[PDB]
Paper text:
We thus refer to the HT-bound carboxylic-acid derivative as TRaQ-G-ctrl, whereas the cyanamide derivative is hereafter called TRaQ-G. GSH titration experiments revealed that, whereas the HT-bound carboxylic-acid derivative was completely insensitive to GSH, the cyanamide ligand bound to HT responded to GSH in the physiologically relevant range of concentrations (~1–20 mM). MD simulations using the spirocyclic form as a starting point suggest that the side chain of residue F144 must rotate to allow for the ligand to occupy the alternative pocket and thus switch to its zwitterionic form. Using MD simulations starting from the zwitterionic structure, we found that the structure rapidly relaxes to a stable conformation in which the cyanamide forms a persistent hydrogen bond with the backbone carbonyl of residue P243.
This sensor is based on binding of a spirocyclic SiR ligand to HT, which induces isomerization to the GSH-sensitive and fluorescent zwitterionic form. We conducted X-ray diffraction experiments and MD simulations for structural elucidation of the different TRaQ-G adducts to gain mechanistic insight into the varying GSH sensitivities of the molecules.
Numbering used by the authors: 4 to 295
The structure:
């Protein structure tokens, strides 16, 4: 699996801040918008995009506060990311899009899709945000960790002072061992502890056991939208997963209309790091079946 990131940097001013993004592939045609989550960046797409860019434009932004994007003094609530992603999509003048989304990137993509349904030609998604009704539906191995994350005192000392979301959660989200070069790429935006606020606010926003109820409600709404939408859907899943265990992937593959599900083999959260070749080639094949 490749550790390089060859893409030329592109930047765009969004709401007064500079955001970075990858932009490759043909300039014509429907673009494919790749949205990463916590605590990654466009780096998480580096081995997927080269499968897609020969036939379709690939756009991969770094979320505000993340990757090579600027670091405004925000709370980095989900609502902050929604505002910046909305403004990024409009700054690039995108019209219709295909989404490829993961983790908090999927909460962004699904929520944008619900509000802009005529502009979404397909959604590929993996290890995505859905409501977790009780802590029992969270993986046992990860339960005490995430309960501690979701506190002001203990959670900030773990995530901000000790950088535990980068040095622990991230490699614990990949089945294979991440290399030192790959870790350094994920570390780069967060070398300064003051810049780690998004790493801590994100898990405090996760819709688990009914809280925070505003996120639970927003996620419920876009899942209800997704269940009733004819949009083409491509779901990647792994064993044992984290957000989407295999029994949930099986349930969704039946319940979501127009859905193809792909078993990538072993995986936790960052499926892209365990089987990028299958995810990228399967996306390129799925795209070639779409009306775009
Ligand atoms: C958008 C959602 C993204 C999900 C990304 C990946 O999520 C899945 C993995 O997240 C990490 C979940 N925690 C564990 O898997 C785990 C399992 C056992 C033990 C820990 C954590 C433990 C630990 C062990 C080694 C290191 N280097 C660090 C850690 Si901690 C500081 C993250 C930790 C904290 C807590 N309480 C807050 C309990 C255990 C750990 N640990 C120890 N000691 C384990 O035995
Ligand atoms: Cl998170």
């Amino acid at each position: 699996i490749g550790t390089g990131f060859p893409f030329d940097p592109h930047y765009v001013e969004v709401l007064g801040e500079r955001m970075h993004y990858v932009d490759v592939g043909p300039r014509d045609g429907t673009p494919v918008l790749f949205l990463h989550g916590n605590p990654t960046s466009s780096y998480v797409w580096r081995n997927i995009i080269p499968h897609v860019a020969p036939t379709h434009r690939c756009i991969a932004p770094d979320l505000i506060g993340m990757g090579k994007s600027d670091k405004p003094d925000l709370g980095y609530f989900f609502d902050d990311h929604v505002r910046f992603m909305d403004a990024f999509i409009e700054a690039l003048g995108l019209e219709e899009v295909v989404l490829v989304i993961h983790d908090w990137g999927s909460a962004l993509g699904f929520h944008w899709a619900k509000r802009n349904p005529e502009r979404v030609k397909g959604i590929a998604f993996m290890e995505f945000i859905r409501p977790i009704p009780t802590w029992d539906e969270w993986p046992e191995f990860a339960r005490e960790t995430f309960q501690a994350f979701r506190t002001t005192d203990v959670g900030r000392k773990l995530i901000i002072d000790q950088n535990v979301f980068i040095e622990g959660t991230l490699p614990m989200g990949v089945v294979r061992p991440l290399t030192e070069v790959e870790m350094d790429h994920y570390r780069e935006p967060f070398l300064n502890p003051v810049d780690r606020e998004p790493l801590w606010r994100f898990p405090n926003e996760l819709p688990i056991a009914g809280e925070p109820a505003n996120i639970v409600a927003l996620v419920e709404e876009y899942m209800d939208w997704l269940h009733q939408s004819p949009v083409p859907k491509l779901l990647f899943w792994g064993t044992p997963g984290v957000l989407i265990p295999p029994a949930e992937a099986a349930r969704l593959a039946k319940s979501l209309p127009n859905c193809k599900a792909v078993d990538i083999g072993p995986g936790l959260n960052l499926l892209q790091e365990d089987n990028p070749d299958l995810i990228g080639s399967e996306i390129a094949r799925w795209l070639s079946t779409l009306e775009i």
